[PDB]
Design a protein around this ligand. Sequence first.
Ligand SMILES: CNC(=O)c1ccc(S(N)(=O)=O)cc1
Length: 185
Amino acid sequence: HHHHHHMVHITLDRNTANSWLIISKDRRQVRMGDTHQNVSDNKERFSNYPMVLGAQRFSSGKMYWEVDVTQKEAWDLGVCRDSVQRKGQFSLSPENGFWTIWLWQDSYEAGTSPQTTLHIQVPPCQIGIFVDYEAGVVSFYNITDHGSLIYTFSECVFAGPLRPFFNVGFNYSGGNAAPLKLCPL
Ligand SMILES: CNC(=O)c1ccc(S(N)(=O)=O)cc1
């Protein structure tokens, strides 16, 4: 892919974070804390899952960013509507306003309804995410494997402004404490 030149500087929005997340000073890294993090509750925070949004909102154009997932066992990445549900249980699907992939139990899957099996030969340490708003496309690239395509959502019905979306995952196993990091341009 030649999407690198639509690179955007993404930062995390503290106010949307689950109350157990720890966002770095530079707002470029997030990890699961071992407790509640001593913040007030608000209507933006994801309550049920270790999720956070980017601060940036996109309503046009082409955008590209990269995320480091080194040594994590579980995570979700992609984009979502600004108006997605924050409280209670929900599935990651385009019907609910999410365009995402994930790692879970040693398999990679795209967040379609129902979920789609991904075929990745080289486990990624960094993921590239490309959004073309006008085309209705969200694509995922394996930066560890020379940028190889992972998955393309096409004919997307965004139906609103988009935000970068992150889930660091739970750490029941003790093997999933590592952060998500936004990689430098
Ligand atoms: C409301 N959150 C929880 O009940 C919760 C919070 C943290 C964990 S972990 N991943 O073991 O650190 C599990 C569950």
